[PDB]
Design an enzyme around this catalytic site. Structure first.
Site, PDB file in Angstrom:
ATOM      1  N   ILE A  71       3.336   3.181  -4.890  1.00  0.00           N
ATOM      2  CA  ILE A  71       2.700   3.823  -6.415  1.00  0.00           C
ATOM      3  C   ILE A  71       2.027   5.128  -5.791  1.00  0.00           C
ATOM      4  CG2 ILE A  71      -0.379   4.009  -6.707  1.00  0.00           C
ATOM      5  CD1 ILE A  71      -0.162   0.517  -6.214  1.00  0.00           C
ATOM      6  N   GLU A 160       2.832  -5.447  -3.668  1.00  0.00           N
ATOM      7  CA  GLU A 160       3.243  -6.686  -1.864  1.00  0.00           C
ATOM      8  C   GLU A 160       3.237  -7.971  -2.484  1.00  0.00           C
ATOM      9  OE1 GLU A 160       3.838  -5.371   0.129  1.00  0.00           O
ATOM     10  OE2 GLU A 160       2.524  -3.781   1.191  1.00  0.00           O
ATOM     11  N   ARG A 163       7.401  -8.144  -4.290  1.00  0.00           N
ATOM     12  CA  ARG A 163       7.921  -8.009  -2.991  1.00  0.00           C
ATOM     13  C   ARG A 163       8.144  -9.920  -2.390  1.00  0.00           C
ATOM     14  NH1 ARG A 163       5.367  -2.772  -0.686  1.00  0.00           N
ATOM     15  NH2 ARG A 163       6.928  -0.764  -1.884  1.00  0.00           N
TER      16      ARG A 163
END
Ligand code: NAG
Ligand code: NAG
Length: 246
Positions: A71, A160, A163
């Site tokens: 970000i 996260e 991912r």
């Protein structure tokens, strides 16, 4: 762009958002059936906009670099805010230029600097859907110390989770009750670059990592990942950082 609303949110609508977030990131190749993010993208198309709405319907828009899911900054009403680092200054040349004022936050976006700003490691900060609702709210008005903890929650519950399917599931388990991340979650976060690189080096090495990756498993046990048959690779990781960026 992709959007997520906390009002009426549940595990299913959060999983829809994390799916949209993964699908918004471009890729030309998959490595061991995992999308491989691009080495680079020029101009404005480097940045994905994520529209997040708190339970009251107030919103911030978060800019994310599509090559690395980092970000860069966010817009809240008429003010933009960017991390104090060259990639985020670059991003401010492309996104939120219509803001009436731009504030550069007094830290970069990495976990070490944000935890210093927040006064606490992320091991001690609950995450979940309620914590994300609080984080969006916090970011609506500038407070740099409060914002650092909000941004630790925002990075973990958006990037996260994109991912790693394990982290997405951890947040779904926290849809109505926050809880600090498991040590497995912390381990995966800290390991994303290393795993992404080893999965790419395994392509001409018969599926074998050149260097083992050490993770903490779901039981608190430290474990070595040595090749692409591991469950971390076949089931969990969803996006690979391109080795050109490592
Ligand atoms: C979405 C975002 O900004 N994420 C990163 C996370 O990817 C990285 O590991 C950490 C660096 O320590 O920095 C956070 O900014
Ligand atoms: C590869 O991975 C598994 C652990 O998931 C391990 O048991 C196996 O023996 C490893 N093989 C090689 C060739 O590294």
């Amino acid at each position: 762009d992709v959007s997520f609303r906390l009002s009426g949110a549940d595990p299913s609508s959060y999983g829809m958002f994390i799916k949209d977030l993964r699908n918004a990131l471009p890729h030309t190749e998959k490595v061991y059936n995992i999308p491989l993010l691009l080495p680079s993208v020029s101009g404005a198309g480097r940045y994905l906009l994520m529209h997040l709405f708190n339970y009251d319907g107030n919103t911030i828009t978060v800019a994310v670099d599509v090559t690395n899911v980092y970000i860069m900054g966010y817009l809240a009403l008429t003010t933009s805010y960017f991390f104090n680092e060259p990639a985020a200054d670059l991003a401010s040349q492309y996104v939120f230029r219509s803001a009436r004022r731009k504030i550069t936050l007094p830290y970069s976006g990495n976990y070490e600097r944000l935890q210093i700003a927040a006064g606490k490691p992320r091991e001690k900060i609950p995450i979940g859907l309620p914590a994300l609702d609080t984080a969006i709210s916090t970011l609506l008005h500038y407070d740099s110390t409060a914002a650092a903890g909000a941004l630790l929650v925002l990075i973990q519950t958006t990037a996260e989770a994109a991912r790693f399917k394990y982290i997405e599931q951890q947040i779904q388990e926290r849809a109505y009750r926050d809880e600090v991340p498991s040590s497995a979650t912390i381990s995966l976060e800290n390991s994303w670059s290393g795993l992404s690189k080893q999965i790419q080096l395994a392509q001409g090495n018969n599926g074998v990592f050149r260097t083992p990756t050490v993770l903490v498993d779901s039981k608190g046990n430290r474990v070595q990942i040595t090749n692409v048959t591991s469950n971390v690779v076949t089931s969990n990781i969803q996006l690979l950082l391109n080795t050109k960026n490592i």
